[PDB]
Design an enzyme around this catalytic site. Sequence first.
Site, PDB file in Angstrom:
ATOM      1  N   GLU A 272      -3.298  -0.807  -0.382  1.00 47.30           N
ATOM      2  CA  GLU A 272      -3.781   0.456   0.222  1.00 47.30           C
ATOM      3  C   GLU A 272      -5.154   0.299   0.831  1.00 47.30           C
ATOM      4  O   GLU A 272      -5.295   0.488   2.041  1.00 47.30           O
ATOM      5  CB  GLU A 272      -3.751   1.570  -0.839  1.00 47.30           C
ATOM      6  CG  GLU A 272      -2.323   1.807  -1.332  1.00 47.30           C
ATOM      7  CD  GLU A 272      -2.085   3.262  -1.736  1.00 47.30           C
ATOM      8  OE1 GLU A 272      -2.810   3.753  -2.591  1.00 47.30           O
ATOM      9  OE2 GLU A 272      -1.132   3.863  -1.179  1.00 47.30           O
TER      10      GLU A 272
ATOM     11  N   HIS B 269       1.171  -0.500  -5.787  1.00 50.64           N
ATOM     12  CA  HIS B 269       1.625  -0.271  -4.398  1.00 50.64           C
ATOM     13  C   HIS B 269       1.903  -1.711  -3.894  1.00 50.64           C
ATOM     14  O   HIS B 269       1.131  -2.640  -4.181  1.00 50.64           O
ATOM     15  CB  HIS B 269       0.566   0.423  -3.501  1.00 50.64           C
ATOM     16  CG  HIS B 269       0.143   1.751  -4.052  1.00 50.64           C
ATOM     17  ND1 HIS B 269       0.963   2.844  -3.963  1.00 50.64           N
ATOM     18  CD2 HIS B 269      -0.929   2.163  -4.756  1.00 50.64           C
ATOM     19  CE1 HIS B 269       0.455   3.845  -4.652  1.00 50.64           C
ATOM     20  NE2 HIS B 269      -0.688   3.467  -5.148  1.00 50.64           N
TER      21      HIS B 269
ATOM     22  N   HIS C  13      -0.205   1.992 -12.205  1.00 49.58           N
ATOM     23  CA  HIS C  13       0.850   1.733 -11.272  1.00 49.58           C
ATOM     24  C   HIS C  13       0.409   0.832 -10.134  1.00 49.58           C
ATOM     25  O   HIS C  13      -0.737   0.440 -10.070  1.00 49.58           O
ATOM     26  CB  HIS C  13       1.374   3.037 -10.706  1.00 49.58           C
ATOM     27  CG  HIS C  13       0.374   3.745  -9.893  1.00 49.58           C
ATOM     28  ND1 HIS C  13      -0.414   4.725 -10.418  1.00 49.58           N
ATOM     29  CD2 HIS C  13       0.000   3.594  -8.597  1.00 49.58           C
ATOM     30  CE1 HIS C  13      -1.251   5.155  -9.481  1.00 49.58           C
ATOM     31  NE2 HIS C  13      -0.991   4.513  -8.361  1.00 49.58           N
TER      32      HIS C  13
ATOM     33  N   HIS D 100       8.490   6.952  -6.571  1.00 47.85           N
ATOM     34  CA  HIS D 100       7.514   6.437  -5.597  1.00 47.85           C
ATOM     35  C   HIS D 100       6.796   5.136  -6.061  1.00 47.85           C
ATOM     36  O   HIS D 100       6.247   4.418  -5.241  1.00 47.85           O
ATOM     37  CB  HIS D 100       6.498   7.459  -5.074  1.00 47.85           C
ATOM     38  CG  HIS D 100       5.781   8.281  -6.106  1.00 47.85           C
ATOM     39  ND1 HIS D 100       6.167   9.564  -6.413  1.00 47.85           N
ATOM     40  CD2 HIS D 100       4.660   8.048  -6.822  1.00 47.85           C
ATOM     41  CE1 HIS D 100       5.322  10.083  -7.282  1.00 47.85           C
ATOM     42  NE2 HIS D 100       4.398   9.185  -7.547  1.00 47.85           N
TER      43      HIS D 100
ATOM     44  N   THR E  21      -3.963   8.869  -3.484  1.00 43.81           N
ATOM     45  CA  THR E  21      -3.357   8.371  -2.235  1.00 43.81           C
ATOM     46  C   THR E  21      -1.910   8.803  -2.081  1.00 43.81           C
ATOM     47  O   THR E  21      -1.255   8.376  -1.145  1.00 43.81           O
ATOM     48  CB  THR E  21      -3.453   6.819  -2.136  1.00 43.81           C
ATOM     49  OG1 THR E  21      -2.746   6.215  -3.214  1.00 43.81           O
ATOM     50  CG2 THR E  21      -4.922   6.320  -2.184  1.00 43.81           C
TER      51      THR E  21
ATOM     52  N   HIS F  21      -3.565   0.269  -9.586  1.00 41.08           N
ATOM     53  CA  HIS F  21      -4.386   1.444  -9.837  1.00 41.08           C
ATOM     54  C   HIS F  21      -4.313   1.805 -11.286  1.00 41.08           C
ATOM     55  O   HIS F  21      -3.192   2.069 -11.793  1.00 41.08           O
ATOM     56  CB  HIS F  21      -3.883   2.640  -8.970  1.00 41.08           C
ATOM     57  CG  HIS F  21      -4.118   2.431  -7.495  1.00 41.08           C
ATOM     58  ND1 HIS F  21      -3.420   3.105  -6.498  1.00 41.08           N
ATOM     59  CD2 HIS F  21      -5.006   1.626  -6.862  1.00 41.08           C
ATOM     60  CE1 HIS F  21      -3.857   2.689  -5.322  1.00 41.08           C
ATOM     61  NE2 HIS F  21      -4.821   1.795  -5.509  1.00 41.08           N
TER      62      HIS F  21
END
Length: 258
Positions: A104, A94, A92, A62, A196, A117
Amino acid sequence: HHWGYGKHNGPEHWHKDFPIAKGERQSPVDIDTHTAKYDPSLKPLSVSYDQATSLRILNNGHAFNVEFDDSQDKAVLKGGPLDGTYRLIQFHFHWGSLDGQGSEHTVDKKKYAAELHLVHWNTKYGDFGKAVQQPDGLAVLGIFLKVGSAKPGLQKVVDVLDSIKTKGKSADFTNFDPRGLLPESLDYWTYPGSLTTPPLLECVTWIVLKEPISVSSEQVLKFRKLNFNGEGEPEELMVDNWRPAQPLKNRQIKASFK
Ligand SMILES: [O-]
Ligand SMILES: [Zn+2]
């Protein structure tokens, strides 16, 4: 049929396996800068990352996580809205399929190209697994990325991504210094929220920095070459691994700055 970010298993589906998806303290949210309340009682954040020990980078299907040794108080976050000491366990990102989406959190509805994050857990609970079951168990530092000039301190991360292209692959990743990822200013918004990704537990004090970092077009292009799938399975590019903004409901976002 596991959760992910596609048409048939993406965020609008997650509530069927994780009912807390429609909870009262879900993340991310839109940060309305005109409705956020300056709270002069908030202390400055204290980031002590000079003794950080990175161990490993991995593609978990992911995102990719860089993991740190959290067996002692080596990389910690204190101060701000937090009571106690929170140890760094992993970071990590996104990101999006294009430069206009990826983050996000949003700021007055503006999406950034990506969101970092840095995940920390409250040492009073003993371990990460116990921390996620508490309302004050985690503290996540969120940092926006916009596309502009290159960030030198990220290049070490982008250069190894070739070696963890598919789900389940890992690589040794020692002596990486996360201080190269911080913006100049540590001014922040804070609100109580959630992981999240599934299990979407409501255990997070979010600390979202006002000042974005800049990365290059070529740097974020390299994130988009990673794969959601495992080796030998059909190729699905790891893009748009972000959850949309959720209802703020009865929460106030506080700012450390006016
Ligand atoms: O996350
Ligand atoms: Zn995240």
